[PDB]
């Protein structure tokens, strides 16, 4: 599924992302924008064995098991297929664990490059939620 921006903002707020560990809602909308353009089915194969899955492009070397990735830790304790649903539950649960490491939202390359240090609240402006 490809979300609209305000649709995703509302869903992420219902899924408890606003102010999770200090990160405002716009951070998460911005990260989704630049990782997947709000596409829950996005997948990207990496040069190592791994693949990035779903709306937040969570990687199979570290965070989920797809069975084909050497070095896999499965830190979120899930199959990577769970990250490809129209239901963002599993992606949000895993994202929360990711950001609960000391590296925080720096886990996401797109967030570092396009969101960090900017007015991420622009991504929820004009949304009614």
């Amino acid at each position, epitope marked *: 599924k490809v979300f609209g921006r305000c649709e995703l903002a509302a869903a992420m707020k219902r899924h*408890g992302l606003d102010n999770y560990r200090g990160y405002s809602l716009g951070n998460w909308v911005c990260a989704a924008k630049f990782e997947s353009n709000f596409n829950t089915q996005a997948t990207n194969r990496n040069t190592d064995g791994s693949t990035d899955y779903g709306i937040l492009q969570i990687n199979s070397r570290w965070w989920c098991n797809d069975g084909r990735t050497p070095g896999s830790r499965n830190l979120c304790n899930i199959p990577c297929s769970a990250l490809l649903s129209s239901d963002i539950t599993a992606s949000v649960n895993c994202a929360k664990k990711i950001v609960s490491d*000391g590296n925080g939202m720096n886990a996401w390359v797109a967030w570092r490059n396009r969101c960090k240090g900017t007015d991420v609240q622009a991504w929820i402006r004009g949304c009614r939620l």
Partner: antibody, heavy 113, light 108 residues
Framework: DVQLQESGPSLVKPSQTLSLTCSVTGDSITSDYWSWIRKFPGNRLEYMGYVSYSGSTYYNPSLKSRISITRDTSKNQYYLDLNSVTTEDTATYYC???????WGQGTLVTVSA | DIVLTQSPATLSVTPGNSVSLSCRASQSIGNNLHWYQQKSHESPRLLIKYASQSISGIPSRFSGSGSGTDFTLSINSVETEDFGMYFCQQSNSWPYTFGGGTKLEIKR
């Protein structure tokens, strides 16, 4: 099937260090996040801290400067050291994964001379 | 720190009746509220995560609801074996904090 087993002394003298070990099966230490929680006498639970995959630690501010949580993945263990204890540190101590699904059995540690 | 306040302190339940346990947060926590059961001599057992998400193997009679600052654990058709302490815990902000507990006892 992930199993956690706590070990360490049940009696610690005031001003000494309380130390416990959590031994984990089925989940590499560096493949998860790992926590310590304690229950004081009147069902009062305190989340002591956790260590995440990168080795970053989060400690409860109540314990700041007295607590260390460390890891030895080669022994598939992680550790709690709590310095300068007093009778106020008497509690039942638990290790658990950060997700909360897997807990060790609980060990009462009494701080007394 | 976020303070979680549970209600009631004690529930005295007739088996087969349904009950509701409350947990209120001093600051908004979204859905970042988890429920645990603890029997005496046992470790806590996770019942519900993230306010309403089910946990593998937990009986369907346990459910959770709420958001923001107001959360509820519902137990349909309470069984005698449901006797124990029930705690909520928030993970929205560090330090994670627990409610003070609700004791579920059986009426007879």
């Amino acid at each position: 099937d992930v199993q956690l087993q706590e070990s360490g002394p049940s009696l610690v003298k005031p001003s000494q260090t309380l130390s416990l070990t959590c031994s984990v099966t089925g989940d590499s230490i560096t493949s998860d996040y790992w926590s310590w929680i304690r229950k004081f006498p009147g069902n009062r639970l305190e989340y002591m801290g956790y260590v995440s995959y990168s080795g970053s630690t989060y400690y409860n501010p109540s314990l700041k400067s007295r607590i260390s949580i460390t890891r030895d993945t080669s022994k598939n263990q992680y550790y709690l050291d709590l310095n300068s204890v007093t009778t106020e540190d008497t509690a039942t101590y638990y290790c658990a994964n950060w997700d909360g699904d897997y807990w060790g059995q609980g060990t009462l540690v009494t701080v007394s001379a | 720190d976020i303070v979680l306040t549970q209600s009631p302190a004690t529930l005295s339940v007739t088996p087969g009746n349904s009950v509701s346990l409350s947990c209120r947060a001093s600051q908004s926590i979204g859905n970042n509220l988890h429920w645990y059961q603890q029997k005496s001599h046992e470790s806590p057992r996770l019942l519900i995560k993230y306010a309403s998400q089910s946990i593998s193997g937990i009986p369907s009679r346990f459910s959770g609801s709420g958001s923001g600052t107001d959360f509820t654990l519902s137990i349909n058709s309470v069984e005698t074996e449901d006797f124990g302490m029930y705690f909520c815990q928030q993970s929205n902000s560090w330090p994670y904090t627990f409610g003070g507990g609700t004791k579920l006892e059986i009426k007879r």
